[PDB]
Symmetry: C3
Subunit: 313 residues, 3 copies
């Protein structure tokens, strides 16, 4: 498809800094070229320059609110631009707090978007339910219209406007959900397939239901926010908050291959890849290679093979 | 639920001794605290003191019959006690020969119990069919009423009374079954899901059929005897008789999460964890961590999340 | 069943030479004995002596055409012999180019054979579509009647006669298919289950459809060409062209256990095991052990257990 690459070297949504290297190691893995090696029209909007905000004391327990709120605000504008250019936005990021700006900017051009969130976590803590204060675990709370009222005025986010309903999002891969988050899950009726549902139904049925659930009433643009820690750490170890028992490399590709086939992918986030956290050089390459593979699947690379519309014989 | 912890540091059901450390490393992993950290009422009945039986020569090929028969006899009494106290017995053990006493004592208070046996092995060899002579591979033969007649008078087990029928037990995870054992399997019509059935049906259907098979006619207490070598050695390597191609960490949790949801768990055995057999310190922690995870799942810990009955928002 | 072992220490179908050691390390793993330890009548036709062909320059891009064409020609004769002796041919090989002779010789005695090809690749490149020139990636193109016309007169293969139709073959495990190969796939209507279909349907349904697809109209002899790189490299690392995201050890055994149960297995190839490519001594033993396990499954070894027709009690 027509892609618009946007690097988001940001890490203040959490404590470990190496995550802002995500765009670099991914590009250095030949991501742009690989995409071009397919049927992809690729334009790199470069890495966004996230100005330093020296004065950013916590808002209550919440950390680096101004820099996070600013990075998402900046990212939101960029995504809206690439979307206005008729391209699928590919946000190579740092931490997942950036999802706030990516989904926000996407919904400005396509307010009817549906979101598929692959993650070991729900990232739906509010500034009042979070125990860690890390904003990469709160993005979803800022985007949900139903949680509009339980989100205090946090410095840096006054530009935010909830753009999606609890019913326009589906979670896949959950295995470490906080108590308040689970409460929000059940209270708002959010559709999710934790690792338990994946085990019960199999990833094939999981994807069937996910797409049917989001595209049933009518076809609508799809936003895929892929947190690499959604996959098992044996595949993506170089990430900040790994949790054992994750989705397999195969399941990761199955998810993306199916989304690609809908022809409705319009926004994509590949987040939380932190090279600095690899215990070895191999753990880093393994994490980056897996991250690239998932990305390519979103844009056509199929395991059964691919061929141009010509007579090869 | 209401739990009654009972440590069973015993190893004479087999050759390698480190298995009697099971209760120690598990407790030292914070098992009691972790359970309390949930909605669990926990009372530790301590570790049973298994007196040394210096004079215990083999009965034919069978090894350490008196100490094994004695340990199970002692364990049987303890379990019956905790069951009489309205608690779910949690037997942290050494080798699986202890299942004889755990299931025996359980059935004294709840004669209508159904058993789910997760294991790479059937542990149903008789003193006459066993080739190794290790009693941890014969527990089931002593408990089955139908095998009453093919079990010789082995020193230390005169207190035993078969308490379950071949139809009140279901095996899950089998992948190394001896010839005589397989014969007993097919001859008594025992329900089992070897790794082949798990591969064919998927763990979801496997659990559906298992519970339906055992709880169909009527709801009855459930005894789960979990041999950690039922899971693949990439998850539980620190165990005496590992067999490749086992159940996954995910499947292990799926099994237990489903059993928990029945609200019928009344007896649980977490066996065969041998710290001494870990090739590295990490293999030990990996085995113990997995063993703890499975245990917590049996008592409520869910991958989709958990929350108290309060308004978190 | 009645087996006829034939070693094929050949490697010129590709660049790395250690693959010709396949027969050796497999035999040294106790394969013959293990088979005999079952209900198998085993006769080893020894290792075929593949005379050196010093003068063998490439035919266009195709490498070592004369030695490859000769090795398959020799192998074809041997297989036909063992098949004429009422035995299931077990070809312990080097590279997969040998499939040309194995399937050719098999079809001479049983022209109605159906083929199950487990592989990460389709190995259906023609001498004109191949980019590497390695013949181990072209065997299928020489065997298909429908591709009769797109296969130039390559030195060493004038003895070849396409013996199977595109509809008498099923692929399982595909995850690295070239563009021209994919074109041939879709153009000839070849049935395949890439890793994507395995993920979607589960290996149980995959095998159900495969057998139904090949044995539907009528029961016919089965030829299983098993490329060990079809399984994930975490199980069979010592192989020339490994591809991540492969079939599991369990799936590998499920496939073979199901084929065995049809009672129609008549030809088997266990290919691409290259001991020289193991990064460690353990990677070699792990590859060989897995290869032996799959082989034993093809001839009866079942994970649920096995027993002779006698009264064990
Ligand atoms: N729920 C935990 C863990 C958050 C993980 C967030 C990562 C981005 O995906 C917290 O709120 O801190
Ligand atoms: N069937 C073999 C292996 C027994 C394994 C027993 C382990 C407890 O689970 C024997 O009888 O010695
Ligand atoms: N398709 C590639 C890779 C071939 C792999 C062949 C291995 C035998 O299974 C080629 O034609 O060279
Ligand atoms: Mn996460
Ligand atoms: Mn996340
Ligand atoms: Mn066992
Ligand atoms: Mn056991
Ligand atoms: Mn291959
Ligand atoms: Mn091959």
């Amino acid at each position: 498809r027509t892609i618009g690459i946007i690097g988001a070297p940001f890490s203040k949504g959490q404590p470990r800094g190496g995550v802002e290297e995500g765009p670099t190691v991914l590009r250095k893995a030949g991501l742009l070229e690989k995409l071009k090696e397919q049927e992809c029209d690729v334009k790199d909007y470069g890495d966004l320059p996230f100005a330093d905000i020296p004065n950013d004391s916590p808002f209550q327990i919440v950390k680096n609110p101004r820099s996070v709120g600013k990075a998402s605000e900046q990212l939101a504008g960029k995504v809206a631009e690439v979307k206005k250019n008729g391209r699928i936005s590919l946000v190579l990021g740092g931490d997942h707090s950036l999802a706030i700006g990516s989904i926000s900017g996407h919904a400005r051009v396509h307010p009817d978007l549906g979101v598929i969130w692959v993650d070991a976590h729900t990232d739906i803590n509010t500034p009042l339910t979070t125990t860690s204060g890390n904003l990469h675990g709160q993005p979803v709370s800022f985007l949900l219209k139903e949680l509009k009222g339980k989100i205090p005025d946090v410095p840096g986010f006054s530009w935010v406007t909830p753009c999606i309903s609890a019913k326009d999002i589906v979670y896949i891969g959950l295995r470490d959900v906080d108590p308040g988050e689970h409460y929000i899950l059940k209270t708002l009726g959010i559709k999710y397939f934790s690792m338990t549902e994946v085990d019960r139904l199999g990833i094939g049925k999981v994807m069937e239901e996910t797409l049917s659930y989001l595209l049933g009433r009518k076809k609508r643009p799809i936003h895929l926010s892929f947190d690499v820690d959604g996959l098992d750490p044996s595949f993506t170890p170089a990430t900040g908050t790994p949790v054992v028992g994750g989705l397999t490399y195969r399941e990761g590709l199955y998810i993306t291959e199916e989304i690609y086939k809908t022809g409705l992918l319009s926004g994509l986030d590949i987040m939380e890849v932190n090279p600095s956290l690899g215990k070895t050089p191999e753990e880093v390459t393994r994490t980056v290679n897996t991250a690239v593979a998932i990305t390519l699947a979103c844009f056509g690379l199929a395991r059964e093979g691919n061929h141009k519309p010509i007579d090869y014989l």
